[PDB]
């Protein structure tokens, strides 16, 4: 019934293309298209890991109590902004052992909703109500890179990189839940297969993107640097 | 025309959506939606283990004894408020042999409904006062992180982290028991498959946030103080 333009750029046109690609369109159906899209995006971001949904940010360690941000889903490289240094993640028992038994390497763990560090780190960041003030990040400022949970659509004008990069993915993953809402199985299976194929293509692209500029050959690393 | 909202975040809207995806509008069926949601939430939390439903609480060790909370499902890392000293679980036959044949590691067991620590550690609870004052944690404390079981809704406006994270999960798992009540097999199969896929996605997400960001080689060397 409804019309739509060639590019599905925004939520407003996606919620109409959904009803178009499925003639099952009416009052009792269009009102829940938002819920189907919500379920589809949740099913997507639950396991999708790609750059465009990443986010880098400084942390405040406070030697221990340091807390995990709300948007934490998976941690990428973690380091500082001074001469470079990469942390490695270990288990709580290793850190508890390091505490008593005893600074080039630095470890960390995940205690519930915290990030513990064996050394008494003193990373500094501006407080909450600070107005602007980039602060010219001081030293001992760790920078964390992780995968952040993207926002949920709340306005027809609201767009997202997924719409501009792969709208068919959302359209199929939401037609799945649509054909589930109504009684239909063939469409469910076909849309699920197509969405899974698109997601596989995207993750394979991400894979072929990483470490894709030259071959590798470990040069028999046996710690040439031992003197220190 | 039962109309639900887009951000499904409460118990009433979830109930209305369950009654919507099962178009039948009859008292014989609507009056049991609460029972179906109860069965679903009891099916999910019975084996779901994730951070958000965890909880931290201070124990009240008197003399190498304790009592498990009434909301205990599974225990993970335990330690003290200072220096760490993660505890490690053992069995009765060992924590009772240590006493006979026994810088100081810690061990604990489960004697039905009582944690039994060998060294006879002592713990204390923090300041209780509710006069808008901090808890003022106590010295010689022991922290425990367990997967607490959530409370039943028993109210419309009530909610939970699942309704915001994965409402489709509870929706499908309760429509499963609904389509079991009425003899509908294909629907049962579809809803169960969808719920299983959702739970698989969730547990996989909980695994890709674990100790991943590092090589698995160079096995650690936590040997001893004797080099």
């Amino acid at each position: 019934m409804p019309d739509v333009q060639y590019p599905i750029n925004t939520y407003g046109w996606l919620k109409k293309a959904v009803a178009l690609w499925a003639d099952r369109d009416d009052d009792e159906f269009v009102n829940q298209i938002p819920n189907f899209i919500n379920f589809a995006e949740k099913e997507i971001y639950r396991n999708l890991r790609i750059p465009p949904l990443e986010k880098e940010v400084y942390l405040d360690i406070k030697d221990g109590v340091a807390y995990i941000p709300p948007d934490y889903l998976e941690a990428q490289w973690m380091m500082r902004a001074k001469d470079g240094t990469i942390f490695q993640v270990t288990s709580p028992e290793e850190i508890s052992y390091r505490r008593q038994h005893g600074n080039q390497p630095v470890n960390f763990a995940r205690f519930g909703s915290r990030f513990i560090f064996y050394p008494s780190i003193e990373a500094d960041t501006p407080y909450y109500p600070d107005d602007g003030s980039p602060l010219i990040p001081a030293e001992n400022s760790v920078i964390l890179s992780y995968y952040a949970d993207p926002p949920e659509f709340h306005e027809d004008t609201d767009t997202s990189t997924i719409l501009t990069i792969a709208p068919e993915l959302l359209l199929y993953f939401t037609l799945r839940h649509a054909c589930l809402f109504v009684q239909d199985d063939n469409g469910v299976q076909k849309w699920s297969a197509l969405g899974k194929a698109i997601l596989d293509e995207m993750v394979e692209q991400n894979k072929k993107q990483e470490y894709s500029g030259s071959p590798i050959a470990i040069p028999n690393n046996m710690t040439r640097l031992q003197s220190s | 025309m039962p109309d639900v909202q887009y951000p499904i975040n409460t118990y009433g809207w979830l109930k209305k959506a369950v009654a919507l995806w099962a178009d039948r509008d009859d008292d014989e069926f609507v009056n049991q939606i609460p029972n179906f949601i109860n069965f679903a939430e009891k099916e999910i939390y019975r084996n779901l283990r994730i951070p958000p439903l965890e909880k931290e609480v201070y124990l009240d060790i008197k003399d190498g004894v304790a009592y498990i909370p009434p909301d205990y499902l599974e225990a993970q890392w335990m330690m003290r408020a200072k220096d760490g000293t993660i505890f490690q679980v053992t069995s009765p036959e060992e924590i009772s042999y240590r006493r006979q044949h026994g810088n100081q590691p810690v061990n604990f067991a489960r004697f039905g409904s009582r944690f039994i620590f060998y060294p006879s550690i002592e713990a204390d609870t923090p300041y209780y006062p509710d006069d808008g004052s901090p808890l003022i944690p106590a010295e010689n404390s022991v922290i425990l992180s367990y997967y607490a079981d959530p409370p039943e809704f028993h109210e419309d406006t009530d909610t939970s982290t699942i309704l915001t994270i994965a409402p489709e999960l509870l929706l499908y798992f309760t429509l499963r028991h609904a389509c079991l009540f009425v003899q509908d097999d294909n629907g049962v199969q579809k809803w169960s498959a969808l719920g299983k896929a959702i739970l698989d996605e969730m547990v996989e997400q909980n695994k890709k946030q674990e100790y991943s960001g590092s090589p698995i080689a160079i096995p650690n060397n936590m040997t001893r103080l004797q080099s």
Partner: peptide
């Protein structure tokens, strides 16, 4: 590149850490 100093505006509709519809009020308060 940035700091987490902005104010709470929404809930984690996807994510096992953070806030919920029954806890966002606490963050805002």
């Amino acid at each position: 590149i940035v700091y987490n100093n902005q104010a709470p505006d929404a809930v984690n509709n996807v994510g096992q850490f953070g806030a919920t519809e029954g806890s966002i009020g606490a963050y805002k308060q």
